[PDB]
Design a protein around this ligand. Structure first.
Ligand SMILES: O=C1Nc2cc(O)ccc2/C1=C/c1ccc(OC(F)F)c(OC2CCCC2)c1
Ligand SMILES: O=C1Nc2cc(O)ccc2/C1=C/c1ccc(OC(F)F)c(OC2CCCC2)c1
Ligand SMILES: [Mg+2]
Ligand SMILES: [Mg+2]
Ligand SMILES: [Zn+2]
Ligand SMILES: [Zn+2]
Lengths: 322, 322
């Protein structure tokens, strides 16, 4: 009922994703992906039959873990909706084709699927089967991709059945390139390249940015989904604080497994010695703001409302520290 | 007796690995690895129980496919032994630690394990489970590593059981770095970096190659195993020709399945339009000789006889075309 009203803000930074999760019966990924596919007219641009989209989105949502506090289907729905908005920055218009747009969105949707709630380093240090499979390199991100594509092969789940063979092949490559770039261990390289693109930036006199080679473009799409993955501190405070509660619950539960198994407690995962508010402001100062300020430069200045909220939320969290 | 006589050649380029395969009851990898570990005193240095070593080597050898013409246990034994000889070159004396020596030989042993006899691109184009798992990136090479490390966990198979935690961490990363560098799609960049090193190379007062950081050391080990992997045309001709027979069988059988399935036949995989001799000449001219000429420069003059044989074999295959 009122699910319909909440969804009408699908194009706005600060969607009530947690409400939409409650109202949809814990299906925010499905309903937000559905809505967005209509808003951008993708069920026809790519001849996706509507029931095939739902069957896949439902199976995909099921492979996010409901007993994981942060890396679940609400985070996936939130990154989807956030990428959907960053794709409409005025300074990007005419930059991405429809296939590149479908790539960033599908990638956002699968980018954390089957997340166990622990870090790559935890999986490596524990000689997990995942790290054995993927040779310690972007272990989670490779797994997210493998599962996300694998589910397409379930019954009536191939939402790409009517893409041409080359379209499928191009989409698969772009999705892989995007999701692999969500690995935080690649944040610094990715930001350095985004800065280089800012210095050597080229633009119409009318604001809009000009990217010509695939290398530059996929680099923007990687940093874009990376943005949406690190967009919690840029949302309104009541949203951000719930995200902070959830990631800290996940960190603490990993630190508890590191304690029970008797290994070193990873940074910020020690519930007996954690400063949640000092961590958030350090997260902003060293990762989220350098990132979003570089991105705001790239799309100068359609990102101001977002860079503003980020600096507001950083001031508030700092004020919670005596 | 006869086998022990042939294994006395284990320090010599052009060891008759096919004889040793026959004389060992199709166990060239087990007996050559065992001989080399004894030769380099590796069982004592790393407290490897001999029964654990034999058990792992036989399990590892089992997981090479006896029905694959080239990428079988004979190729693995050949690359192990060729790497063993390259490690002994005078320009590298006392350069590498026993752990790095262990990493390079171990990497050589597992570097093609469970190879199905088709290329990465074929596994990508046939939507294989392997390409699905590894997101189209170094599909085979990631799989070889996952299998080689996983078999260490079988009953009495952990040959690294008495290494320190730090030794095992360091070895695992070096082995991963080395095997991933055997992906031929990385050959151009790996050779470009090897050229740069030769142009700027440093030698010690003892005349030996100076490598004072991990990036330089792992790059030499990467190219060394890469050279051993592409060493068939540098071997005595009667060995080279049998390798060419085996790789062409594998190519033709892949091209058969490509034709059977409606796909374009990969280059050199079409038996009805193959040019074996011209392909070997182009293989040497564009891949093998540029690589080995650069390696010979790096270790000059230690590799002059190997380079001479390569140029003789090139001339011979060339002379069979008119
Ligand atoms: O901690 C994280 N590790 C990650 C690794 C990845 O490959 C991708 C994202 C994150 C991530 C995200 C994250 C998302 C939200 C956070 O806080 C808040 F915005 F919800 C947050 O805070 C942690 C970092 C310092 C304090 C706890 C971290
Ligand atoms: O063809 C190949 N593709 C590869 C991909 C890899 O990641 C690693 C090795 C090879 C390889 C090796 C190879 C090894 C020996 C050959 O011939 C001979 F030396 F045995 C040979 O010839 C083929 C390439 C040109 C003609 C056939 C190819
Ligand atoms: Mg992730
Ligand atoms: Mg190989
Ligand atoms: Zn995420
Ligand atoms: Zn090989």
């Amino acid at each position: 009922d009122v699910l319909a009203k909440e969804l009408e803000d699908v194009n706005k930074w600060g969607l009530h994703v947690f409400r939409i999760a409650e109202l949809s019966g814990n299906r925010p990924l499905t309903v937000i992906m559905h809505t967005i596919f209509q808003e951008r007219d993708l069920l026809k641009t790519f001849k996706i039959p509507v029931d095939t989209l739902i069957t896949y989105l439902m199976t995909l949502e099921d492979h996010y873990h409901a007993d994981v506090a942060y890396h679940n289907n609400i985070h996936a729905a939130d990154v989807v909706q956030s990428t959907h908005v960053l794709l409409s920055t005025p300074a990007l218009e005419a930059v991405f084709t429809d296939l590149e747009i479908l790539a960033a969105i599908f990638a956002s949707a699968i980018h954390d699927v089957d997340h166990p709630g622990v870090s790559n380093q935890f999986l490596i240090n524990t000689n997990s089967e995942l790290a054995l499979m993927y040779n310690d390199s972007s272990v989670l991100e490779n797994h997210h991709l493998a599962v996300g594509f694998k589910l397409l092969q379930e019954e009536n789940c191939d939402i790409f059945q009517n893409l041409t063979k080359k379209q499928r092949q191009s989409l698969r490559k772009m999705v892989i390139d995007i999701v692999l770039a969500t690995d935080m261990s690649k944040h610094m390289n990715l930001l350095a390249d985004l800065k280089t693109m800012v210095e050597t930036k080229k633009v119409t006199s009318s604001g809009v940015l000009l990217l010509d080679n695939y290398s530059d473009r996929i680099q923007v799409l990687q940093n874009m989904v990376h943005c949406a993955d690190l967009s919690n501190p840029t949302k309104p405070l009541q949203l951000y604080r719930q995200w902070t509660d959830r990631i800290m619950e996940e960190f603490f539960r990993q630190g508890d497994r590191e304690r029970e198994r008797g290994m070193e407690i990873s940074p910020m995962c020690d519930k007996h010695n954690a400063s949640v508010e000092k961590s958030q402001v350090g997260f902003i100062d060293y990762i989220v703001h350098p990132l979003w300020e570089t991105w705001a430069d790239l799309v100068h200045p359609d990102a101001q409302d977002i860079l503003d909220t980020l600096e507001d939320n950083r001031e508030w969290y700092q004020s919670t520290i005596p």
